[PDB]
Amino acid sequence: GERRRSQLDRDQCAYCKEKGHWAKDCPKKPRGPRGPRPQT
DNA sequence: ACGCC
Ligand SMILES: [Zn+2]
């Protein structure tokens, strides 16, 4: 019962911790299928 | 924030 780990487990999304996706698949995170590099 | 690998 790790109350200290209130969020950000392995189960849940690292980025935004929403619904049932993950930080691999996060729609908030700019995973644009076009090279979403810190440049363009 | 990845990754749960
Ligand atoms: Zn997310």
Side-chain angles (χ1 to χ4, degrees):
Chain A
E2 305 91 85
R3 295 182 66 183
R4 296 189 297 177
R5 193 177 72 263
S6 56
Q7 58 163 247
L8 228 169
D9 217 309
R10 300 239 289 281
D11 301 81
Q12 63 188 122
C13 176
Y15 201 88
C16 84
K17 27 281 162 172
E18 192 180 87
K19 54 203 180 204
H21 70 245
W22 218 34
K24 298 295 301 196
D25 188 53
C26 186
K28 314 297 180 59
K29 186 183 178 303
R31 291 185 170 281
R34 55 165 290 280
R37 52 164 64 176
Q39 175 178 95
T40 179

mmCIF file of all heavy atoms in Angstrom:
data_model
loop_
_atom_site.group_PDB
_atom_site.id
_atom_site.type_symbol
_atom_site.label_atom_id
_atom_site.label_comp_id
_atom_site.label_asym_id
_atom_site.label_seq_id
_atom_site.Cartn_x
_atom_site.Cartn_y
_atom_site.Cartn_z
ATOM 1 N N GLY A 1 0.828 -1.217 0.000
ATOM 2 C CA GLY A 1 0.000 0.000 0.000
ATOM 3 C C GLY A 1 0.859 1.262 0.000
ATOM 4 O O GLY A 1 0.870 2.006 0.979
ATOM 5 N N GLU A 2 1.593 1.485 -1.097
ATOM 6 C CA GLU A 2 2.579 2.548 -1.218
ATOM 7 C C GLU A 2 1.895 3.881 -1.529
ATOM 8 O O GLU A 2 1.933 4.354 -2.664
ATOM 9 C CB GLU A 2 3.622 2.188 -2.289
ATOM 10 C CG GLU A 2 4.294 0.829 -2.043
ATOM 11 C CD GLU A 2 3.551 -0.308 -2.741
ATOM 12 O OE1 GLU A 2 3.835 -0.510 -3.941
ATOM 13 O OE2 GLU A 2 2.697 -0.935 -2.074
ATOM 14 N N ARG A 3 1.296 4.497 -0.504
ATOM 15 C CA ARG A 3 0.657 5.806 -0.598
ATOM 16 C C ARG A 3 1.628 6.872 -1.116
ATOM 17 O O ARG A 3 1.212 7.780 -1.834
ATOM 18 C CB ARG A 3 0.088 6.217 0.767
ATOM 19 C CG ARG A 3 -1.044 5.280 1.217
ATOM 20 C CD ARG A 3 -1.642 5.728 2.555
ATOM 21 N NE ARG A 3 -2.320 7.027 2.440
ATOM 22 C CZ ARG A 3 -2.890 7.689 3.460
ATOM 23 N NH1 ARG A 3 -2.877 7.179 4.700
ATOM 24 N NH2 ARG A 3 -3.478 8.873 3.235
ATOM 25 N N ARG A 4 2.918 6.752 -0.766
ATOM 26 C CA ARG A 4 3.978 7.623 -1.258
ATOM 27 C C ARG A 4 4.010 7.635 -2.789
ATOM 28 O O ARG A 4 4.073 8.707 -3.388
ATOM 29 C CB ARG A 4 5.335 7.190 -0.687
ATOM 30 C CG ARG A 4 5.379 7.335 0.841
ATOM 31 C CD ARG A 4 6.795 7.115 1.388
ATOM 32 N NE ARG A 4 7.272 5.749 1.131
ATOM 33 C CZ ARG A 4 8.494 5.289 1.450
ATOM 34 N NH1 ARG A 4 9.388 6.083 2.055
ATOM 35 N NH2 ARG A 4 8.818 4.022 1.162
ATOM 36 N N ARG A 5 3.930 6.455 -3.421
ATOM 37 C CA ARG A 5 3.781 6.341 -4.865
ATOM 38 C C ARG A 5 2.303 6.527 -5.216
ATOM 39 O O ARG A 5 1.616 5.583 -5.602
ATOM 40 C CB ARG A 5 4.355 5.003 -5.359
ATOM 41 C CG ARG A 5 4.486 5.007 -6.891
ATOM 42 C CD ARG A 5 5.126 3.726 -7.436
ATOM 43 N NE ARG A 5 4.213 2.578 -7.345
ATOM 44 C CZ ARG A 5 4.184 1.645 -6.378
ATOM 45 N NH1 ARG A 5 5.019 1.685 -5.333
ATOM 46 N NH2 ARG A 5 3.295 0.650 -6.457
ATOM 47 N N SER A 6 1.821 7.765 -5.070
ATOM 48 C CA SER A 6 0.453 8.160 -5.361
ATOM 49 C C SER A 6 0.118 7.986 -6.845
ATOM 50 O O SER A 6 -1.026 7.692 -7.185
ATOM 51 C CB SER A 6 0.265 9.613 -4.917
ATOM 52 O OG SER A 6 1.215 10.449 -5.546
ATOM 53 N N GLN A 7 1.114 8.170 -7.722
ATOM 54 C CA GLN A 7 0.983 8.029 -9.162
ATOM 55 C C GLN A 7 2.286 7.490 -9.758
ATOM 56 O O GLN A 7 3.238 7.193 -9.037
ATOM 57 C CB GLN A 7 0.598 9.385 -9.778
ATOM 58 C CG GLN A 7 1.622 10.483 -9.456
ATOM 59 C CD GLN A 7 1.469 11.680 -10.387
ATOM 60 O OE1 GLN A 7 2.355 11.957 -11.194
ATOM 61 N NE2 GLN A 7 0.344 12.389 -10.287
ATOM 62 N N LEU A 8 2.326 7.412 -11.092
ATOM 63 C CA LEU A 8 3.495 7.094 -11.886
ATOM 64 C C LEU A 8 4.074 5.707 -11.569
ATOM 65 O O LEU A 8 5.277 5.552 -11.364
ATOM 66 C CB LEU A 8 4.499 8.261 -11.793
ATOM 67 C CG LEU A 8 4.989 8.651 -13.189
ATOM 68 C CD1 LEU A 8 5.768 9.973 -13.147
ATOM 69 C CD2 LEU A 8 5.859 7.538 -13.784
ATOM 70 N N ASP A 9 3.205 4.689 -11.584
ATOM 71 C CA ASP A 9 3.587 3.283 -11.522
ATOM 72 C C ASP A 9 4.037 2.804 -12.911
ATOM 73 O O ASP A 9 4.252 3.602 -13.825
ATOM 74 C CB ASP A 9 2.395 2.447 -11.011
ATOM 75 C CG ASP A 9 2.823 1.299 -10.097
ATOM 76 O OD1 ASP A 9 3.716 0.527 -10.507
ATOM 77 O OD2 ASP A 9 2.270 1.234 -8.977
ATOM 78 N N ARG A 10 4.148 1.483 -13.067
ATOM 79 C CA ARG A 10 4.388 0.818 -14.337
ATOM 80 C C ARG A 10 3.073 0.542 -15.049
ATOM 81 O O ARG A 10 3.039 0.575 -16.267
ATOM 82 C CB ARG A 10 5.226 -0.443 -14.127
ATOM 83 C CG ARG A 10 6.570 -0.042 -13.500
ATOM 84 C CD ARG A 10 7.770 -0.448 -14.359
ATOM 85 N NE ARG A 10 7.999 -1.900 -14.366
ATOM 86 C CZ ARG A 10 8.597 -2.609 -13.396
ATOM 87 N NH1 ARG A 10 8.948 -2.032 -12.238
ATOM 88 N NH2 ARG A 10 8.852 -3.910 -13.588
ATOM 89 N N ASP A 11 1.992 0.316 -14.305
ATOM 90 C CA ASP A 11 0.645 0.159 -14.838
ATOM 91 C C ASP A 11 0.226 1.351 -15.714
ATOM 92 O O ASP A 11 -0.165 1.185 -16.869
ATOM 93 C CB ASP A 11 -0.319 0.029 -13.652
ATOM 94 C CG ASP A 11 0.028 -1.160 -12.760
ATOM 95 O OD1 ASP A 11 0.953 -0.995 -11.934
ATOM 96 O OD2 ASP A 11 -0.633 -2.208 -12.921
ATOM 97 N N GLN A 12 0.285 2.547 -15.121
ATOM 98 C CA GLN A 12 -0.257 3.801 -15.637
ATOM 99 C C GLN A 12 0.739 4.583 -16.504
ATOM 100 O O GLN A 12 1.946 4.350 -16.438
ATOM 101 C CB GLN A 12 -0.731 4.645 -14.442
ATOM 102 C CG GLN A 12 0.429 5.011 -13.503
ATOM 103 C CD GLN A 12 -0.037 5.668 -12.208
ATOM 104 O OE1 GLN A 12 0.256 5.173 -11.124
ATOM 105 N NE2 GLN A 12 -0.723 6.804 -12.306
ATOM 106 N N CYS A 13 0.216 5.529 -17.303
ATOM 107 C CA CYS A 13 1.005 6.415 -18.153
ATOM 108 C C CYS A 13 1.937 7.281 -17.307
ATOM 109 O O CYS A 13 1.512 7.899 -16.335
ATOM 110 C CB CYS A 13 0.096 7.288 -19.040
ATOM 111 S SG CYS A 13 0.967 8.516 -20.047
ATOM 112 N N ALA A 14 3.217 7.317 -17.683
ATOM 113 C CA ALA A 14 4.241 8.100 -17.007
ATOM 114 C C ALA A 14 4.031 9.604 -17.176
ATOM 115 O O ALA A 14 4.324 10.387 -16.275
ATOM 116 C CB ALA A 14 5.610 7.723 -17.577
ATOM 117 N N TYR A 15 3.553 9.996 -18.358
ATOM 118 C CA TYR A 15 3.486 11.367 -18.822
ATOM 119 C C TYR A 15 2.339 12.119 -18.162
ATOM 120 O O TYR A 15 2.537 13.178 -17.569
ATOM 121 C CB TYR A 15 3.295 11.334 -20.343
ATOM 122 C CG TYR A 15 3.699 12.604 -21.064
ATOM 123 C CD1 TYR A 15 5.029 12.769 -21.479
ATOM 124 C CD2 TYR A 15 2.757 13.614 -21.330
ATOM 125 C CE1 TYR A 15 5.421 13.932 -22.163
ATOM 126 C CE2 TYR A 15 3.139 14.769 -22.033
ATOM 127 C CZ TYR A 15 4.472 14.928 -22.451
ATOM 128 O OH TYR A 15 4.840 16.048 -23.137
ATOM 129 N N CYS A 16 1.142 11.548 -18.299
ATOM 130 C CA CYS A 16 -0.129 12.161 -17.964
ATOM 131 C C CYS A 16 -1.012 11.267 -17.096
ATOM 132 O O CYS A 16 -1.964 11.790 -16.518
ATOM 133 C CB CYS A 16 -0.867 12.540 -19.249
ATOM 134 S SG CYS A 16 -1.816 11.212 -20.033
ATOM 135 N N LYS A 17 -0.717 9.956 -16.994
ATOM 136 C CA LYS A 17 -1.435 9.034 -16.120
ATOM 137 C C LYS A 17 -2.950 9.153 -16.335
ATOM 138 O O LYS A 17 -3.706 9.457 -15.413
ATOM 139 C CB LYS A 17 -0.952 9.128 -14.655
ATOM 140 C CG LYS A 17 -0.356 10.449 -14.147
ATOM 141 C CD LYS A 17 1.106 10.657 -14.579
ATOM 142 C CE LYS A 17 1.509 12.126 -14.439
ATOM 143 N NZ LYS A 17 2.953 12.311 -14.668
ATOM 144 N N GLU A 18 -3.368 8.904 -17.584
ATOM 145 C CA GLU A 18 -4.750 8.937 -18.044
ATOM 146 C C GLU A 18 -5.126 7.548 -18.568
ATOM 147 O O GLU A 18 -4.256 6.772 -18.965
ATOM 148 C CB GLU A 18 -4.893 10.014 -19.132
ATOM 149 C CG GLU A 18 -6.349 10.349 -19.487
ATOM 150 C CD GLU A 18 -6.437 11.414 -20.576
ATOM 151 O OE1 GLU A 18 -6.408 11.026 -21.766
ATOM 152 O OE2 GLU A 18 -6.530 12.603 -20.204
ATOM 153 N N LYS A 19 -6.437 7.271 -18.581
ATOM 154 C CA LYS A 19 -7.118 6.108 -19.102
ATOM 155 C C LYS A 19 -6.305 4.811 -19.058
ATOM 156 O O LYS A 19 -5.990 4.337 -17.968
ATOM 157 C CB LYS A 19 -7.737 6.500 -20.448
ATOM 158 C CG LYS A 19 -6.801 7.110 -21.506
ATOM 159 C CD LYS A 19 -7.631 7.933 -22.501
ATOM 160 C CE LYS A 19 -6.748 8.562 -23.584
ATOM 161 N NZ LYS A 19 -7.374 9.759 -24.168
ATOM 162 N N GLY A 20 -6.010 4.220 -20.220
ATOM 163 C CA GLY A 20 -5.406 2.902 -20.326
ATOM 164 C C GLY A 20 -4.308 2.842 -21.383
ATOM 165 O O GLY A 20 -3.880 1.743 -21.732
ATOM 166 N N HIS A 21 -3.831 3.995 -21.877
ATOM 167 C CA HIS A 21 -2.636 4.025 -22.716
ATOM 168 C C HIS A 21 -1.401 4.071 -21.806
ATOM 169 O O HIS A 21 -1.513 3.884 -20.594
ATOM 170 C CB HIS A 21 -2.707 5.173 -23.738
ATOM 171 C CG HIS A 21 -2.577 6.551 -23.147
ATOM 172 N ND1 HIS A 21 -3.569 7.500 -23.165
ATOM 173 C CD2 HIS A 21 -1.541 7.178 -22.515
ATOM 174 C CE1 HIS A 21 -3.086 8.561 -22.496
ATOM 175 N NE2 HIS A 21 -1.800 8.479 -22.123
ATOM 176 N N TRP A 22 -0.219 4.324 -22.378
ATOM 177 C CA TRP A 22 1.025 4.412 -21.627
ATOM 178 C C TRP A 22 1.912 5.519 -22.187
ATOM 179 O O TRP A 22 1.599 6.071 -23.238
ATOM 180 C CB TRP A 22 1.708 3.045 -21.717
ATOM 181 C CG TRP A 22 2.414 2.551 -20.504
ATOM 182 C CD1 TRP A 22 2.056 2.766 -19.220
ATOM 183 C CD2 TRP A 22 3.591 1.705 -20.452
ATOM 184 N NE1 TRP A 22 2.963 2.163 -18.381
ATOM 185 C CE2 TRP A 22 3.918 1.469 -19.089
ATOM 186 C CE3 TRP A 22 4.388 1.078 -21.427
ATOM 187 C CZ2 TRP A 22 5.007 0.676 -18.707
ATOM 188 C CZ3 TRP A 22 5.507 0.317 -21.062
ATOM 189 C CH2 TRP A 22 5.805 0.102 -19.705
ATOM 190 N N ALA A 23 3.031 5.836 -21.520
ATOM 191 C CA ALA A 23 3.960 6.843 -22.032
ATOM 192 C C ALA A 23 4.560 6.450 -23.390
ATOM 193 O O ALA A 23 5.010 7.321 -24.134
ATOM 194 C CB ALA A 23 5.024 7.183 -20.988
ATOM 195 N N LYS A 24 4.512 5.155 -23.742
ATOM 196 C CA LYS A 24 4.840 4.650 -25.068
ATOM 197 C C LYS A 24 3.870 5.167 -26.137
ATOM 198 O O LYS A 24 4.261 5.327 -27.292
ATOM 199 C CB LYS A 24 4.755 3.124 -25.072
ATOM 200 C CG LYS A 24 5.749 2.457 -24.123
ATOM 201 C CD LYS A 24 7.231 2.646 -24.461
ATOM 202 C CE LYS A 24 7.573 2.108 -25.849
ATOM 203 N NZ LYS A 24 9.030 1.955 -26.014
ATOM 204 N N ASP A 25 2.604 5.364 -25.752
ATOM 205 C CA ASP A 25 1.470 5.645 -26.628
ATOM 206 C C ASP A 25 0.745 6.946 -26.240
ATOM 207 O O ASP A 25 -0.409 7.141 -26.618
ATOM 208 C CB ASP A 25 0.519 4.438 -26.522
ATOM 209 C CG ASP A 25 -0.635 4.467 -27.523
ATOM 210 O OD1 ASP A 25 -0.341 4.615 -28.729
ATOM 211 O OD2 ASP A 25 -1.790 4.329 -27.064
ATOM 212 N N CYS A 26 1.380 7.841 -25.471
ATOM 213 C CA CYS A 26 0.665 8.974 -24.902
ATOM 214 C C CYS A 26 0.301 9.995 -25.989
ATOM 215 O O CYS A 26 1.180 10.419 -26.737
ATOM 216 C CB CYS A 26 1.474 9.613 -23.775
ATOM 217 S SG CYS A 26 0.608 10.935 -22.884
ATOM 218 N N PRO A 27 -0.980 10.392 -26.091
ATOM 219 C CA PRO A 27 -1.473 11.357 -27.058
ATOM 220 C C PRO A 27 -1.147 12.801 -26.651
ATOM 221 O O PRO A 27 -1.138 13.685 -27.506
ATOM 222 C CB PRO A 27 -2.973 11.102 -27.111
ATOM 223 C CG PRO A 27 -3.308 10.734 -25.669
ATOM 224 C CD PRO A 27 -2.078 9.934 -25.256
ATOM 225 N N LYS A 28 -0.876 13.044 -25.361
ATOM 226 C CA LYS A 28 -0.463 14.344 -24.852
ATOM 227 C C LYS A 28 0.965 14.616 -25.318
ATOM 228 O O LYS A 28 1.274 15.691 -25.827
ATOM 229 C CB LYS A 28 -0.520 14.377 -23.317
ATOM 230 C CG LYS A 28 -1.791 13.794 -22.691
ATOM 231 C CD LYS A 28 -3.057 14.569 -23.067
ATOM 232 C CE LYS A 28 -4.295 13.942 -22.415
ATOM 233 N NZ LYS A 28 -4.195 13.910 -20.944
ATOM 234 N N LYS A 29 1.821 13.605 -25.144
ATOM 235 C CA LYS A 29 3.188 13.597 -25.623
ATOM 236 C C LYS A 29 3.174 13.680 -27.155
ATOM 237 O O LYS A 29 2.386 12.972 -27.781
ATOM 238 C CB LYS A 29 3.865 12.313 -25.133
ATOM 239 C CG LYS A 29 5.361 12.262 -25.454
ATOM 240 C CD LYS A 29 5.923 10.913 -24.993
ATOM 241 C CE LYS A 29 7.412 10.743 -25.318
ATOM 242 N NZ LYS A 29 7.701 10.886 -26.755
ATOM 243 N N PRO A 30 4.012 14.528 -27.774
ATOM 244 C CA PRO A 30 4.019 14.732 -29.216
ATOM 245 C C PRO A 30 4.722 13.568 -29.927
ATOM 246 O O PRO A 30 5.818 13.724 -30.462
ATOM 247 C CB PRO A 30 4.725 16.076 -29.420
ATOM 248 C CG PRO A 30 5.716 16.117 -28.258
ATOM 249 C CD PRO A 30 4.928 15.456 -27.127
ATOM 250 N N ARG A 31 4.068 12.401 -29.961
ATOM 251 C CA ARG A 31 4.501 11.247 -30.737
ATOM 252 C C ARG A 31 3.948 11.370 -32.160
ATOM 253 O O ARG A 31 3.193 10.516 -32.620
ATOM 254 C CB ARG A 31 4.044 9.952 -30.046
ATOM 255 C CG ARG A 31 4.809 9.724 -28.738
ATOM 256 C CD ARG A 31 4.421 8.375 -28.124
ATOM 257 N NE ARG A 31 5.289 8.013 -26.993
ATOM 258 C CZ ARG A 31 6.530 7.506 -27.088
ATOM 259 N NH1 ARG A 31 7.110 7.318 -28.281
ATOM 260 N NH2 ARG A 31 7.196 7.189 -25.970
ATOM 261 N N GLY A 32 4.336 12.445 -32.857
ATOM 262 C CA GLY A 32 3.915 12.703 -34.222
ATOM 263 C C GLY A 32 4.653 11.761 -35.178
ATOM 264 O O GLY A 32 5.881 11.714 -35.124
ATOM 265 N N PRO A 33 3.949 11.013 -36.049
ATOM 266 C CA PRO A 33 4.555 10.053 -36.963
ATOM 267 C C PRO A 33 5.143 10.782 -38.179
ATOM 268 O O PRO A 33 4.668 10.630 -39.303
ATOM 269 C CB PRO A 33 3.414 9.099 -37.330
ATOM 270 C CG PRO A 33 2.193 10.017 -37.315
ATOM 271 C CD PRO A 33 2.499 10.967 -36.156
ATOM 272 N N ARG A 34 6.181 11.590 -37.937
ATOM 273 C CA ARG A 34 6.818 12.443 -38.933
ATOM 274 C C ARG A 34 8.204 12.912 -38.471
ATOM 275 O O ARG A 34 8.724 13.889 -39.009
ATOM 276 C CB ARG A 34 5.907 13.649 -39.225
ATOM 277 C CG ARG A 34 5.538 14.409 -37.940
ATOM 278 C CD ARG A 34 4.956 15.790 -38.254
ATOM 279 N NE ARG A 34 5.978 16.712 -38.775
ATOM 280 C CZ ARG A 34 6.871 17.385 -38.029
ATOM 281 N NH1 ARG A 34 6.933 17.214 -36.702
ATOM 282 N NH2 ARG A 34 7.709 18.252 -38.613
ATOM 283 N N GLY A 35 8.797 12.252 -37.465
ATOM 284 C CA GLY A 35 10.002 12.739 -36.812
ATOM 285 C C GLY A 35 9.669 14.015 -36.035
ATOM 286 O O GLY A 35 9.893 15.108 -36.550
ATOM 287 N N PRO A 36 9.126 13.901 -34.811
ATOM 288 C CA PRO A 36 8.653 15.021 -34.020
ATOM 289 C C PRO A 36 9.826 15.521 -33.177
ATOM 290 O O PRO A 36 9.738 15.619 -31.954
ATOM 291 C CB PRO A 36 7.534 14.414 -33.174
ATOM 292 C CG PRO A 36 8.086 13.023 -32.845
ATOM 293 C CD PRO A 36 8.947 12.669 -34.063
ATOM 294 N N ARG A 37 10.952 15.779 -33.847
ATOM 295 C CA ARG A 37 12.218 16.054 -33.198
ATOM 296 C C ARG A 37 12.199 17.470 -32.601
ATOM 297 O O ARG A 37 11.437 18.312 -33.076
ATOM 298 C CB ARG A 37 13.372 15.849 -34.198
ATOM 299 C CG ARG A 37 13.185 16.612 -35.517
ATOM 300 C CD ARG A 37 14.491 16.702 -36.314
ATOM 301 N NE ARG A 37 14.978 15.383 -36.736
ATOM 302 C CZ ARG A 37 16.059 15.194 -37.513
ATOM 303 N NH1 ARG A 37 16.773 16.237 -37.961
ATOM 304 N NH2 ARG A 37 16.425 13.947 -37.842
ATOM 305 N N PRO A 38 13.021 17.761 -31.575
ATOM 306 C CA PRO A 38 13.137 19.091 -30.986
ATOM 307 C C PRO A 38 13.898 20.018 -31.945
ATOM 308 O O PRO A 38 15.061 20.351 -31.723
ATOM 309 C CB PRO A 38 13.859 18.873 -29.652
ATOM 310 C CG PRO A 38 14.735 17.653 -29.930
ATOM 311 C CD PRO A 38 13.855 16.812 -30.855
ATOM 312 N N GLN A 39 13.216 20.405 -33.028
ATOM 313 C CA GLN A 39 13.746 21.103 -34.192
ATOM 314 C C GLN A 39 12.591 21.349 -35.169
ATOM 315 O O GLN A 39 12.443 22.458 -35.680
ATOM 316 C CB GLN A 39 14.855 20.259 -34.844
ATOM 317 C CG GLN A 39 15.385 20.852 -36.153
ATOM 318 C CD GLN A 39 16.517 19.992 -36.711
ATOM 319 O OE1 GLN A 39 16.291 19.131 -37.559
ATOM 320 N NE2 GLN A 39 17.741 20.213 -36.228
ATOM 321 N N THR A 40 11.781 20.312 -35.425
ATOM 322 C CA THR A 40 10.624 20.357 -36.306
ATOM 323 C C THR A 40 9.705 19.173 -35.992
ATOM 324 O O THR A 40 10.235 18.063 -35.776
ATOM 325 C CB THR A 40 11.054 20.385 -37.785
ATOM 326 O OG1 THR A 40 9.912 20.400 -38.618
ATOM 327 C CG2 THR A 40 11.944 19.202 -38.188
ATOM 328 O "O5'" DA B 1 6.852 13.358 -18.793
ATOM 329 C "C5'" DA B 1 7.616 12.630 -17.856
ATOM 330 C "C4'" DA B 1 8.719 11.825 -18.558
ATOM 331 O "O4'" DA B 1 9.588 11.276 -17.579
ATOM 332 C "C3'" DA B 1 8.203 10.661 -19.410
ATOM 333 O "O3'" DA B 1 9.154 10.324 -20.413
ATOM 334 C "C2'" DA B 1 8.178 9.597 -18.337
ATOM 335 C "C1'" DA B 1 9.516 9.866 -17.662
ATOM 336 N N9 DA B 1 9.633 9.265 -16.319
ATOM 337 C C8 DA B 1 8.659 9.101 -15.370
ATOM 338 N N7 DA B 1 9.075 8.557 -14.260
ATOM 339 C C5 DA B 1 10.427 8.339 -14.491
ATOM 340 C C6 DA B 1 11.456 7.762 -13.717
ATOM 341 N N6 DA B 1 11.256 7.286 -12.481
ATOM 342 N N1 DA B 1 12.692 7.682 -14.248
ATOM 343 C C2 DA B 1 12.895 8.142 -15.481
ATOM 344 N N3 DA B 1 12.016 8.700 -16.311
ATOM 345 C C4 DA B 1 10.779 8.766 -15.748
ATOM 346 P P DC B 2 8.765 10.238 -21.979
ATOM 347 O OP1 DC B 2 10.007 10.072 -22.767
ATOM 348 O OP2 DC B 2 7.870 11.373 -22.285
ATOM 349 O "O5'" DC B 2 7.908 8.872 -22.090
ATOM 350 C "C5'" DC B 2 8.471 7.628 -22.481
ATOM 351 C "C4'" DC B 2 9.622 7.157 -21.579
ATOM 352 O "O4'" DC B 2 9.263 7.178 -20.215
ATOM 353 C "C3'" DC B 2 10.016 5.697 -21.830
ATOM 354 O "O3'" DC B 2 11.079 5.591 -22.760
ATOM 355 C "C2'" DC B 2 10.420 5.209 -20.433
ATOM 356 C "C1'" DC B 2 10.261 6.438 -19.548
ATOM 357 N N1 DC B 2 9.923 6.054 -18.152
ATOM 358 C C2 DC B 2 10.964 5.721 -17.282
ATOM 359 O O2 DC B 2 12.130 5.696 -17.671
ATOM 360 N N3 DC B 2 10.659 5.427 -15.984
ATOM 361 C C4 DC B 2 9.392 5.451 -15.547
ATOM 362 N N4 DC B 2 9.151 5.173 -14.261
ATOM 363 C C5 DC B 2 8.307 5.762 -16.432
ATOM 364 C C6 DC B 2 8.621 6.025 -17.722
ATOM 365 P P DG B 3 11.384 4.206 -23.536
ATOM 366 O OP1 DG B 3 12.703 4.320 -24.192
ATOM 367 O OP2 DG B 3 10.192 3.872 -24.353
ATOM 368 O "O5'" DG B 3 11.509 3.132 -22.333
ATOM 369 C "C5'" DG B 3 11.098 1.790 -22.496
ATOM 370 C "C4'" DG B 3 11.057 1.038 -21.154
ATOM 371 O "O4'" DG B 3 10.343 1.825 -20.207
ATOM 372 C "C3'" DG B 3 10.266 -0.258 -21.378
ATOM 373 O "O3'" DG B 3 10.711 -1.423 -20.681
ATOM 374 C "C2'" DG B 3 8.850 0.200 -21.065
ATOM 375 C "C1'" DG B 3 9.045 1.296 -20.006
ATOM 376 N N9 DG B 3 8.015 2.364 -20.051
ATOM 377 C C8 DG B 3 7.538 3.051 -21.137
ATOM 378 N N7 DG B 3 6.525 3.827 -20.881
ATOM 379 C C5 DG B 3 6.335 3.684 -19.512
ATOM 380 C C6 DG B 3 5.331 4.242 -18.663
ATOM 381 O O6 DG B 3 4.353 4.913 -18.987
ATOM 382 N N1 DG B 3 5.540 3.934 -17.319
ATOM 383 C C2 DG B 3 6.598 3.173 -16.851
ATOM 384 N N2 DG B 3 6.728 3.062 -15.525
ATOM 385 N N3 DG B 3 7.493 2.580 -17.660
ATOM 386 C C4 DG B 3 7.302 2.863 -18.980
ATOM 387 P P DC B 4 10.540 -1.731 -19.093
ATOM 388 O OP1 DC B 4 10.821 -0.498 -18.328
ATOM 389 O OP2 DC B 4 11.335 -2.943 -18.799
ATOM 390 O "O5'" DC B 4 8.975 -2.134 -18.891
ATOM 391 C "C5'" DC B 4 8.485 -2.440 -17.597
ATOM 392 C "C4'" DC B 4 7.107 -3.127 -17.534
ATOM 393 O "O4'" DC B 4 6.021 -2.257 -17.802
ATOM 394 C "C3'" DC B 4 6.940 -4.345 -18.457
ATOM 395 O "O3'" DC B 4 6.891 -5.574 -17.746
ATOM 396 C "C2'" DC B 4 5.574 -4.089 -19.094
ATOM 397 C "C1'" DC B 4 4.937 -3.110 -18.102
ATOM 398 N N1 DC B 4 3.701 -2.395 -18.551
ATOM 399 C C2 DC B 4 2.756 -2.060 -17.572
ATOM 400 O O2 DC B 4 2.911 -2.382 -16.395
ATOM 401 N N3 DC B 4 1.652 -1.350 -17.941
ATOM 402 C C4 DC B 4 1.457 -0.969 -19.207
ATOM 403 N N4 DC B 4 0.399 -0.201 -19.485
ATOM 404 C C5 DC B 4 2.370 -1.360 -20.244
ATOM 405 C C6 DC B 4 3.467 -2.062 -19.868
ATOM 406 P P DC B 5 8.197 -6.217 -17.044
ATOM 407 O OP1 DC B 5 7.869 -7.606 -16.654
ATOM 408 O OP2 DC B 5 8.692 -5.274 -16.016
ATOM 409 O "O5'" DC B 5 9.252 -6.263 -18.266
ATOM 410 C "C5'" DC B 5 9.366 -7.402 -19.099
ATOM 411 C "C4'" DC B 5 10.114 -7.083 -20.400
ATOM 412 O "O4'" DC B 5 9.329 -6.284 -21.262
ATOM 413 C "C3'" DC B 5 11.445 -6.335 -20.228
ATOM 414 O "O3'" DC B 5 12.536 -7.216 -20.394
ATOM 415 C "C2'" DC B 5 11.416 -5.295 -21.351
ATOM 416 C "C1'" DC B 5 10.225 -5.721 -22.199
ATOM 417 N N1 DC B 5 9.622 -4.570 -22.923
ATOM 418 C C2 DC B 5 9.911 -4.387 -24.278
ATOM 419 O O2 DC B 5 10.696 -5.127 -24.868
ATOM 420 N N3 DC B 5 9.297 -3.362 -24.941
ATOM 421 C C4 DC B 5 8.447 -2.537 -24.310
ATOM 422 N N4 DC B 5 7.863 -1.558 -25.010
ATOM 423 C C5 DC B 5 8.166 -2.686 -22.911
ATOM 424 C C6 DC B 5 8.788 -3.701 -22.265
HETATM 425 ZN ZN ZN C 1 -0.535 9.786 -21.257
#
